[PDB]
Structure formats: C-alpha cells, structure tokens
Design a protein around this ligand. Structure first.
Ligand SMILES: O=c1cc[nH]c(=O)[nH]1
Ligand SMILES: O=c1cc[nH]c(=O)[nH]1
Lengths: 201, 196
C-alpha cells in the first residue's frame, strides 16, 4: 500500500543485485549492500531478515519482471501477437538488467540451492496453467502443434542468451544489445524464427 | 596421453564443481593418479589447463558445424546439428556448465579463443548459410542469430537442468523427455527457417 516503503525496498533490492553480481553470495556482506543502498544495516534487516532472505528476494524480483507478460496471457489473446510481445519484452530485460540474468544463471549452475522451492512451487504452478492455455490454442488451430513447455523454454533460452553469453556474442558480432541497431536485428530474428516455427499451417 | 585424458577429465570435474580460483592443481593430480610435476609437464599452469578443458568442449560442440558444406541439404544439416547438440547436453552437462560459468565471468581466460578461432569459424559458416538464404533454400534470416538460437536452446537443457526438472519432472537422461526435446527444438527452428 505504501509507496515510500515500496521505494525503499526497491533501493535495497537494486543494491543487493549489484553487489551479489560483483562479489557472489558467500563473498557479499550485508554491510556492503546497506552502504551501497544508503541504509543502515538494521533498516535492511527489518525488510530482509538474513542474507539468504535477501538473495531469494532478488531472485524472486527477477522472476517477477521476467514472468509478467506470461502471467498476463489469457485464452482470449491473439497468440502470435502475444508471443511476439513476450519475446521483445524478454530481450529488453536482457538489454537493461543483464546483471540480473547472470545472477539467476549462476544460481541455476549451482543446482538452485536457495531457489529450488520457488521453482517447484509457484513457477511450476504458473507454467502448468499457461501450458494448458497454450495447448488450447493448439487445439483451436491458432498455433501449430508444439509442446508448450518447450516453446516456453526456447523463449527463455534464446532471449537470456544475449545477456548470459554477451562476451561470445560480442566476440562473434562486434555488438551488444546496447547497440540499438543490433538490438533491433536480434528482436527481428528471434521473433521470426520462433513465430514462423509455431504459426499454424 | 591416457594420462593426458585422465588429467583433463579430473580437471573438468574439479573446475566444474569448485571454480577456477577454488581448484588446486594438487587435487586434480591426485584424482588423475599423477604427480603434480607430471601434470605440469602437460599443462604448465592452472590457466593452461582450464583453457584446455574449455577448448575440448568447444571442439565437441563445433564438430558438426565445422562439417557444414555448401552442397549439403540445409534444413537436414541444421536438423542433425540440433540433435547432436542435444546429445552433448545430455552426455557432457558438466562441460556445458563450466563453459557457461566462464561466460558469466566475462570470459576472462577464454576471450582470445572467442575473438580468434571461433570468430573465424563463425564468419566462414555464416557466409555459407547466407548463401543458402540468398539461394532461397532458407527463409530470410541472419545466420549468426540462427546459430545463437541453436546454441542457446540446446545448452539450456544442461545449464538450466534444475529448472527444467522442477517444471517438467524430467531431465535429458530420461529417454522419453530427450526424444520430446529433440522433436520440439527441431520443429520450432526448422519450421521457423523453412522457405515459404
Ligand atoms: O523468463 C524466465 C522465467 C523463469 N526462468 C527463466 O529462466 N526465465
Ligand atoms: O556450440 C557452441 C559453440 C560455441 N559456443 C557455444 O556457446 N556453443
């Protein structure tokens, strides 16, 4: 309900993200996050009672940003338009918050020791629901027959790649997503491949 | 050489678990059944050994793409590449994860391999695939992005295995799920690049 409280939380989460990125979970101290955020350590602990709780909150915030378009899917949407928009929003996040994408990737590489409950609970429940929705679209003949979970994974993988594998992308192409021309070429290619791959025939 | 393979295999398992800075050459030598002196004969530094491990997964990954020739059937060639890449994610997930960790770090040790030999290969094979596009044997796509989608989509199933399992109950070590994954990744990419 409180905007001032919400802003303070965001400031702490933003400092935590940037710190957990430069130094890792075990290397990060709460005193470093508080200092970067301009808050007392006691104020930080009021909101996030441990380093573990704060780290999980940073990762839940990235999931929130990433999943917002998919959560919004309704049976009523134009499927190919909705999926196009989803791919574009995902690439914008890789362009704008690459450090979040990398932190999430690092937690996955570690076997999701702190995030596993969020994956098996709330994420699984969401993907189950939207998979049924997408399957309805297939039944209706609005999409070619594909397994929805694999479509979803393809979208995640293809768009996150440009953040997580940025040094390789740059080595190969000379560009990153912060080059506006390259950004646009990327969107156009990822969208064409996925959309023409699921368009009904 | 059987010794060199033992050292590389021990190194992969150790690095992929503990990271570069956390790994000791004494641990790798012990696992490989060699002295640290004998290890250093083959690999004169931890950096050299790490780079060797990462060049080996590059070699395995790139073999199908290196084989591409102008006169191949393009959709068939790409379809086969996707399958072979998923076989690698099933069989060598630790190597995929180690390579991903090196990328997340900004490729501090691997960057020269990426800007040198990798770039040269991708330039040659991008020209080849662009010739296929020019000829109307593929849809109007940009080859580098098609290549990146293949790498991303196939490597995802190793690198993000915890999430794939949390969501689906499966991994690529489950035969039904592996077959399903190949079928679906192939269908999306191949139908997305088929000329219309
Ligand atoms: O967009 C998403 C959502 C969940 N997990 C991912 O890897 N990406
Ligand atoms: O298959 C490959 C080859 C190079 N780099 C990757 O990420 N994947």
């Amino acid at each position: 309900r409180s905007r001032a409280v919400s802003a303070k939380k965001k400031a702490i989460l933003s400092a935590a993200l940037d710190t957990f990125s430069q130094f890792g979970f075990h290397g990060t101290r709460l005193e470093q996050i508080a200092e970067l955020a301009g808050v007392s350590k006691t104020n930080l602990l009021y909101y996030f009672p441990s380093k573990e709780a704060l780290y999980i909150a940073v990762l839940r915030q990235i999931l929130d940003i990433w999943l917002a378009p998919l959560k919004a899917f309704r049976e009523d949407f134009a499927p190919l338009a909705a999926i196009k928009e989803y791919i574009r929003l995902k690439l914008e996040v890789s362009r704008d918050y690459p450090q979040a994408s990398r932190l999430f990737c690092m937690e996955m590489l570690a076997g999701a020791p702190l995030l596993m409950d969020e994956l098996t609970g709330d994420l699984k429940a969401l993907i189950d629901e939207k998979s049924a929705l997408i399957a309805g679209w297939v039944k209706s003949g609005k999409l070619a027959p594909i397994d929805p979970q694999h479509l979803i994974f393809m979208i995640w993988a293809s768009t996150q790649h440009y953040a997580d594998f940025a040094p390789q992308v740059e080595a190969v192409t000379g560009a990153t997503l912060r080059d506006e021309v390259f950004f646009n070429q990327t969107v156009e290619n990822v969208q064409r491949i996925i959309i023409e791959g699921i368009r009904p025939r």
